[model samples]
Target: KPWWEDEWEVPRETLKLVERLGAGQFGEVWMGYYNGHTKVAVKSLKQGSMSPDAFLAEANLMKQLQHQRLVRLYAVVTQEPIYIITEYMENGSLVDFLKTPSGIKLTINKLLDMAAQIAEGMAFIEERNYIHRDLRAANILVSDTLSCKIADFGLARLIEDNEYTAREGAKFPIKWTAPEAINYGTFTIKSDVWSFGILLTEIVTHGRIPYPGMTNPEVIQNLERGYRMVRPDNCPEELYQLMRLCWKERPEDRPTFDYLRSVLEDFFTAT
Candidate 1:
């Protein structure tokens, strides 16, 4: 059954904001308690940025998604000053977590655990015919237990016939995007795999900026010239090979999330 089948509207008055977690152009995210009891993360969207119907449509799809590796949507406040509530991740975004003192102490085994968890979550989405158009480290949430889940489904879309293409010139996260996605705005599970490759680099490097010191234009130019990021220091050669496989110029040459998940699963067990 879909999680959205039941009404999950939350009252604004019942929320007690604790602290701001993050912010973006559309709105801000905050840590709060619901009904003074349940800890929750609230994402408030600007009222004028999107129509109520469109917002609800997206939220409807997001609410139905459920997996251990995916963050759960708890409730939504659809009235004026909209808010989307979900389980609060104590460790916050993977990017921020990797930069923390405790995060810096993570051993290779622990890092592989996080990577495997992320791949599992993505595999779940892929199996459901959904494309997580945004799969950057910042969009991945980490729990106190070091469990990682895919979050921030603002750009996620359900494919009608196995694919979707955004309106030409639509903006995307360049550093974490695939070549086809950057050039044609075409998004598919394979493209997401490419972003996953970039994320692998981010993970192995402890969240270093992708293509550090290079402007967006420079990154694009280099990619056009068949250049790929050199393997990060200390990353296992096997993992580096997987990253390269994901960045293959031809989408058909890239492996599916199922394959990636199985590989990571084996890697996890062996480590």
Candidate 2:
């Protein structure tokens, strides 16, 4: 049964809020305990900040997407002071995780495995005909066991398209979004592939910001002209070549997630 479709309204009493994990201009992310046992990440929203209709609508989309590589949405609290509960990722965001002491020690072998894991997750998402318009390192969460699960996938609908390229919260995801999606049309699995290439750079380079000092407009212009990032110092030529294929000028020319997952897995085996 589709429990999410059944409209789960988690009991308000069972949730015990913990320390703040992150924040935006109007909202905060918190660590919470559920049913006195499970630790979860809660997205806290105050009343009237956004219409309840829009709020649950986003949760509505999230609950339907269930995958091993994707972060799991545990429940949603529908009453005032909304709480969107999800499985807690102990290592936090992939970008932040890479800079941490434990992350710094991950060798290329581990990075290769991580890439394969994300590609497999993305493969499942693409096969389901879902487009994670916001795929990026910051949107990837890391668990205590060092597994990577995608976050903020279907929730892109909640943000205004025009504001994505400039705002602090949405800026990082937008900078790496496919050029076609930014300039001409709706996002597809192909568009996500383009973003995946940039994400590859992020993983290999230890989460350095894409395009270094270049502005978003400049990066967009360069991409239209066929400029892509050069391999970072430690990147393997094979992986760099794969990222190049991902940035192909034509969307159909790019490799599919299934192929990426297989090729990346092959790379892992040889390493």
Candidate 3:
């Protein structure tokens, strides 16, 4: 049954709040123990911080999306202060995992595993006709077992609506967003392919933020001027070529996610 459609609140009777998890601009995340066994995450949005429409949209989106590589929303509350309860991922985010002492030198196999998980998650989003407008390392979460899932869909958009098309002086998902998203329209699976290109490059570089040390305007200038992001040495040729196709100036030039996934699979087989 649909969790949100049922309008059922997350039962906290057996869940005990143990401690705070992390804070964000909107609010904080909490780590809680459920039924004295399972760990879960509860995120409460700051009071009056998010619009009703936006909040419900986000809630409904999560409630509908269910994939192994995508975080699951077990329950949601829409009262004065909104709350979302989701599965607890013990390893936190990709950025956090990499910064830890033991996380360095993660083998090529591990990186490839993470990459495959990301691709699978993204494939699900594309299949649902949704575009994760923002695709960055920080938005990716890793489980204790090193499985990756795509999270934070605040900037996600429906492919048909294109409500987020770039306008003059308009707010857009520029960073980690594709080059065509600015000129043509909201991000599509193809545009997301471009983002995946940047994402892969960032992973190979040990989580360096794409276009670091540049202002928003500068990033736009550089990309529009044909200055592409450089690939690191560890990147496989097939993957590098795929990223190049993704970074192509024309969105149509980017390959489908299915094709990209296939190529990566083949690359792994040969390596």
Candidate 4:
């Protein structure tokens, strides 16, 4: 049974638009008040990007999925130019947050907490046989409480049986994607693990862009030659080692989210 089959339908007129948050590939997001009371983030889809069935499918998946570190889907507005309602995050995107002066003041404990929360979210999805094709800091949302929540499921898909079916020639954010995803057009939980390592770098470096000054061709060539980004300044060596494990040449060699979470937990406890 679809979880959203009996969910509430939010009428457009009930929402009080406040400000534009940001734009995504699927649509524009707005910070608004629901029924003039509950503050919510509204993602208005780009017209013609999704059919009715497609929208319903995505909504059903989002509705059923829940985790402390995963963004919550409140309701769906199924009328023309559909909208996805979610919890509003005051801090916005993780990348943007880390770049702010207030964000830079985060202590090591806080940093580890954010990473662990994100890993917990990824592990939750992994256990459910879902691959977050896009798993970068930019897709992570930060709450007023400094909690990190995984958001944006535009590229997320479920694994069939025990494996994911590869889609050939699909467009993706090349920089954060795994080598196999770019080279062979393959995607799996391990590919997301690779992107997670890049996310760590982004957080540790206070939101430095990955592969700075490198063109697309250069990045591909460098990755093909088994090169990985250097450790972020002031980052612990242990974390860098874990990052390297995520960037293993073979996807099979990468650590599972479960394993990564355990290691991170141990690291936190020790430090």
Against the true structure, what is each candidate's TM-score?
0.93, 0.89, 0.87, 0.91
- Compared with the true structure, the alpha-carbon lDDT of candidate 4 equals 0.84
TM-score, cand. 3: 0.87
Q: Looking at model 3, which ten-residue stretch has the lowest summed lDDT?
A: 161-170
Superposed Cα deviation of residue 248, candidate 3 (Å): 1.1
| Per-residue lDDT over 1-271 for candidate 2, one digit per residue giving the tens place of the 0 to 100 score | 2434555677789899888998875468899899988999998776767776676665776776788998988888876777788889999999999999989999888998999999988888777666777788998999999999988754444232322232333333456877767665556678889999999999998999988888878887787787887567788999999999989988889999999999999999998
Q: In model 4, where do residues sit more than 4 Å from their true spots? A: 1-5, 23-27, 46-57
Q: Please give, for residues 102-136, the per-residue lDDT of candidate 1 as tens digits.
A: 98999888888888889899999999999998998
Superior candidate under TM-score, 2 versus 3: 2
lDDT string, candidate 3, 71-130, tens digits: 877676666567777888888888778767746778766776677678878888888888
RMSD of each: 2.4, 4.3, 2.8, 2.3
Residue 223 displacement in candidate 4 (angstroms): 1.8
Predicted candidate 4 versus true structure: per-residue lDDT over 44-148, tens digit per residue: 878877676676666667876788778888888887787778888899999999989989898776787788889999999999889888899999999998989
Q: Select the stronger candidate by lDDT from 1 and 4.
A: 1
Question: Could you say which candidate leads in lDDT?
Answer: 1
